[PDB]
Design a protein around this ligand. Structure first.
Ligand SMILES: CCCCNC(=O)c1ccc(-c2cc3c(Nc4ccccc4)c(C(=O)NC4CC4)cnc3cc2F)cc1F
Length: 155
């Protein structure tokens, strides 16, 4: 039972994607999607919506399941079971929160050098609209020791 539920939301429009520069906590100094820990008493999809609203002020009509990524950190007992979602249908204008500074990127200008190193592997599958299952084992925030990645028909 040693896994913890997380969400990660990508706002993907036909010619741009929304990311946020993380200002504090894990992944600070990287362009992240919007997400975090799923709480007691909410569904995974409601956690995804709650994280998106807290970090960007955005609400959404619909969120689509696009992937699952399991992260393992050496010395951390809980695996992080990240449910990844996509939306085109955003409600509102993204605004800066305490945690995140939102910015739109063109799909050929993805800032991979200032992103989590795992993004170079799985994020292209999200942009290519393929559903995926990923696993990445980290030693600290910079070093991938092992990984798996595949496409799936069901997230
Ligand atoms: C005791 C609890 C553990 C303390 N540390 C953590 O909480 C923690 C450490 C790291 C990560 C983590 C986040 C990632 C991450 N962002 C993320 C993921 C889930 C929830 C929120 C943001 C991305 C991402 O945003 N990619 C861009 C294309 C969209 C990519 N790779 C990631 C790898 C990671 F390992 C998440 C955490 F929650």
């Amino acid at each position: 039972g040693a896994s913890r539920l997380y969400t990660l939301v990508l706002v993907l429009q036909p010619q741009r994607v929304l990311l946020g520069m993380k200002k504090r906590g894990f992944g600070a100094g990287r362009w992240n999607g919007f997400g975090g820990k799923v709480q007691e008493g909410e569904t995974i999809e409601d956690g995804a919506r709650r994280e998106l609203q807290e970090e960007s002020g955005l609400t959404v009509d619909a969120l689509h399941k696009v992937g699952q990524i399991v992260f393992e950190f050496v010395g951390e007992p809980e695996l992080m079971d990240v449910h990844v979602f996509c939306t085109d249908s955003i409600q509102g204008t993204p605004v800066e929160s305490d945690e995140m500074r939102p910015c739109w990127f063109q799909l050929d200008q993805i800032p991979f050098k200032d992103m989590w190193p795992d993004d170079s592997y799985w994020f292209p599958l999200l942009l290519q609209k393929k559903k995926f299952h990923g696993y990445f084992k980290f030693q600290g925030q910079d070093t991938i020791l092992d990984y798996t990645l595949r496409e799936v028909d069901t997230v």
